[PDB]
Design a protein around this nucleic acid. Structure first.
Ligand SMILES: [Mg+2]
Ligand SMILES: [Mg+2]
Ligand SMILES: [Mg+2]
Ligand SMILES: [Mg+2]
Ligand SMILES: [O]
Ligand SMILES: [O]
Ligand SMILES: [O]
Lengths: 28, 141, 82
RNA sequence: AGGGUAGCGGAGAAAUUCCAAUCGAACCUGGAGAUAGCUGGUUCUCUCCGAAAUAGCUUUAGGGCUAGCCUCAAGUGAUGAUUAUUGGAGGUAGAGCACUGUUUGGACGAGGGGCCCCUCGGGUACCGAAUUCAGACAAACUCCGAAUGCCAAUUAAUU
RNA sequence: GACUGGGGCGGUCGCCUCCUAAAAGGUAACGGAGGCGCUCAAAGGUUCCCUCAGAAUGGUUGGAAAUCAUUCAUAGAGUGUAAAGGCAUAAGGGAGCUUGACUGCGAGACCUACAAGUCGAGCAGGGUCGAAAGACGGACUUAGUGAUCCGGUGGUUCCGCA
RNA sequence: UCUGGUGACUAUAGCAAGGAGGUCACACCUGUUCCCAUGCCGAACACAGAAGUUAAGGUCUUUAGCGACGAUGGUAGCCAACUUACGUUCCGCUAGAGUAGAACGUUGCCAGGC
């Protein structure tokens, strides 16, 4: 998830850019 | 038939060598030695037989060497087959002989008994031969 | 006879088309490859950048020149087009 | 003799046998000029040019598609080819043992095993590795390394 | 179902590395050797620091196997993983801090029939390490994979049969 | 070109051995109060000092024992051509490796002391 509140997940079986406020954030 | 002379393989299949030409390989150990001269290569079985001969006819002990060893296999596959499928199993080992190697060498005896035993060898190999004395290399540095 | 019974080793189409792709005395453009390789079979010199498979290129135009460094390992070095 | 059963069927003491001389499912017409990556056949002269039998993918290998290789008409415009000269990447032939691994005979000492003496040691054929002298082997070993070819030249001659 | 040294049974069908491969590349065979259908929140990034296996000898654990101890030791070690290539300023081994395993792009080159693949300086946004220059768009390199159609989940400067 | 710092050059530089010198270089060196730092340790790094010394490191001289370089000559191989089917031969280009000879105890640039 994100705290820009939009799913971005490069994972499978954290203070970083997300392109809605130009910031870097948790996700998650 | 018989393959006493053998080693660790490292690999059991190999593209052959087939001989073209060379000279060289003088005598360094003994005095008298046999020079292979011509068209063939060899298996171990043959060499063993030649050694039996060369050990019998010389009593008085009398020293022998074999300057070469078969480092190479000789593959040959089941009887009455169609060609194609994977390269075959092992039957033999090989010591190639260009013209100029010096298979057998001896010392401790005179000039004659050597020469006889070497006749009695060269009848028991493919290659034509030649009798040699150790008097000179072609280099001493 | 036929069939009986073996490997089939052999995985025989395995290609990547390496090598060299320019030569000495050859004008060349920025971003252009000179020489693919692996490891450092050639090192870079000046006006060069390397990549995530040990490729080589030229960051800037010029003229290709290979060289020797230490009796073993070479290097490539663009120098300025006059 | 007179009658019946009719084919996605009938009858069959059963053999896949008979069903108008034919039966692993009759016969005629119509769909129907069915389909065929297969064979076979394709009609009048000259002139100019001129191949291929390969790569890849293909429920594909005797077919196909694309790229190759040809032809024609425009366009480009000396860019192409051969040679000379310089430079250059790789590591074959060959040679070699410096790594890998193989090998022969020496030197061997580091030292052991028993049989035996001692009884603390002597150990008297075989040996590992220790260190080395010399001689050899290799597509999947290389301290090295040719000829040829390959790539470019604000280079020159021919075409 | 195709290959298929008649066909069948057997074996294989994709991808990575080598050799055969003829000193560029490419180059087949039911030719010869090995693997892969992942793993990591650190084994990544970055700033600092360091250099191993083996050998000799003395010493508890005495295959001189365990840690020690210096000396010799040009890489014979180790390199997440299979082999070739590569590395000692390190690409290996440890410590601090972080998390570039970012966004939008991309001239220009390779490769190739196509579809796909590969590499990429450089611009801008906004950041981590570092004093600063500078470095960072995953892992020393390459394999760790699957068109399209269809269905699903989330979002939105879209359309929505007057 | 005496010393020192920093650059370039295929180890012809090196490696082994021995001789000589230091308070102007540098080093050993005294110590750990502060900077800071050692996974144990001021050994290392670092800071503060300059008690002693040329022993070591490092510098200079000489050695060719080891390693790297290394021609010339001729050999193997091979491009082209003629014969030939001969584990081919003859002729014309080219030209290894190994090896002997010999070379080698570095060479130059910039600054600053001198
Ligand atoms: Mg009947
Ligand atoms: Mg018809
Ligand atoms: Mg076509
Ligand atoms: Mg050879
Ligand atoms: O027909
Ligand atoms: O037809
Ligand atoms: O037909």
């Amino acid at each position: 998830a994100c705290t820009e509140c939009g799913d971005r997940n490069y994972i499978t079986t954290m203070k970083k850019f997300c392109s809605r406020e130009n910031k870097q954030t948790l996700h998650r | 038939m018989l393959l006493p002379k053998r080693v660790k393989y490292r690999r059991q299949h190999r593209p052959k060598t087939t001989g073209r030409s060379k000279g060289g390989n003088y005598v360094t150990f003994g005095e008298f030695g046999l020079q292979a001269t011509t068209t063939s290569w060899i298996t171990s079985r043959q060499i063993e037989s030649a050694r039996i001969a060369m050990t019998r006819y010389m009593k008085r002990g009398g020293k022998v060497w074999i300057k070469i060893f078969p480092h190479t296999p000789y593959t040959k596959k089941p009887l009455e087959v169609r060609m194609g499928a994977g390269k075959g199993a092992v039957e033999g080992w090989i010591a190639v002989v260009k013209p100029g190697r010096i298979l057998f060498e001896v010392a401790g005896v005179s000039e004659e008994v050597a020469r006889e035993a070497l006749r009695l060898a060269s009848h028991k190999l493919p290659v034509k031969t030649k009798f040699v004395k150790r008097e000179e290399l072609g280099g001493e540095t | 006879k036929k069939g009986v019974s073996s490997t089939k080793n052999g995985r025989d189409s395995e290609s990547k088309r390496l090598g060299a792709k320019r030569a000495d005395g050859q004008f060349v453009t920025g971003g252009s490859i000179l020489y693919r390789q692996r490891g450092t079979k050639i090192y870079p010199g000046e006006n060069v950048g390397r990549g995530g498979d040990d490729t080589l290129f030229a960051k800037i135009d010029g003229v290709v020149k290979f060289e020797r460094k230490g009796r073993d390992k070479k290097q490539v070095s663009v120098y300025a087009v006059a």
